[PDB]
Amino acid sequence: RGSHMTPKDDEFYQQWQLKYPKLILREASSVSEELHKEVQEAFLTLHKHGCLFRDLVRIQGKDLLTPVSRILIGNPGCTYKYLNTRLFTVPWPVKGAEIAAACETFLKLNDYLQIETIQALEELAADIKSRAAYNVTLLNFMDPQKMPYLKEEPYFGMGKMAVSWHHDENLVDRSAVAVYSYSCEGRDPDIWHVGFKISWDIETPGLAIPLHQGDCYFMLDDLNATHQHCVLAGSQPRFSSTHRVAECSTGTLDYILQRCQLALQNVCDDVDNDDVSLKSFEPAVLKQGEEIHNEVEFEWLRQFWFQGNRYRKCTDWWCQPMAQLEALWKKMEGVTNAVLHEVKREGLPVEQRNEILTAILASLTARQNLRREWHARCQSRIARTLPADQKPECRPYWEKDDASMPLPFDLTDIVSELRGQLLEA
């Protein structure tokens, strides 16, 4: 049988040094009581207002609600995608009433953990400042009494898991992760731990680090890639603040707005009307436009409104931007329509038409498939169990009658029509 080690074991500390040197633990008594209280006030402020929600993630085909409920706080405009679900940052006051105060506290905590990480990363050596530049945190909460449906840890006999074994995805390469853990009020089943294992390995015994009132641990350098980790549930309620360097190259509002603007360079923009005229019918420009169409629709709009309107409760930072992206997306439906008018006109040579079809066909087929996948995910079993606060909306969705939208939602006819023309002898 597989086994684990805790601080109570004698081999525990030689194993920390030898096989987990990139894991660092700072006890509660190293962090100031000024900051402890401020952070513990911010937890409750966000919990009372109902900012934390259980995510409806997709994982190996299945639709699952996470045991832990959570909120993402971070730089304004930044997003963090995990388990096929994009979380949107309730913003913090970065350079340049009660909910905004709580978010400022977590920025203060974030700067404190950044200092301790740069310190530890310098000590590791004897690119550092970028790989400790935490741009977001992911606050998590769970009450084991009110949420007593927890899986048993399979490999080492650690017991109930609030979160099972995994890597933190979508992080900057070799970036650190700092975690503040706060409870209320073999391994002790009543106390919250964090589990650690080497990847692919259940022979080498795992590590269970106990966490109490404000204990902080740090995943450094390649640890998160080389090792997996889980959270082990205790009996009392427990908050955590997990600070990450999110790889947000393509996951910011500034980025998606710029992409939208690049797609609309192909349309005559004197006036905003339904008569959308395109400047070029070159394969590359059209290919690019429909790729951008899919990017704004599926990575931003449907991701937002799938969780929506849960964000409106604790902030309204995203309200104006998401309306702006919907307007931009609505224009791009006109572009697709204008492309379909071009391929379906009497004056085009068959060769020109087929170059245009080859350019857009993969983008349109992907659009159909993802629309079905999203429409199915909105109307699943567990999706129709959430309250009216978090009702999985399927926006954008419009009916076959709806004459404001130029093209239909269901693209099956449009798609197979275009495939037919490409196979013509």
Ligand SMILES: CCN(CC)C(=O)/C(C#N)=C/c1cc(O)c(O)c([N+](=O)[O-])c1
């Ligand atoms: C102890 C507090 N923590 C540690 C930081 C967490 O709550 C946590 C982590 N990590 C949650 C988490 C984050 C993810 O990005 C992710 O993909 C998954 N997952 O695969 O289910 C879980």
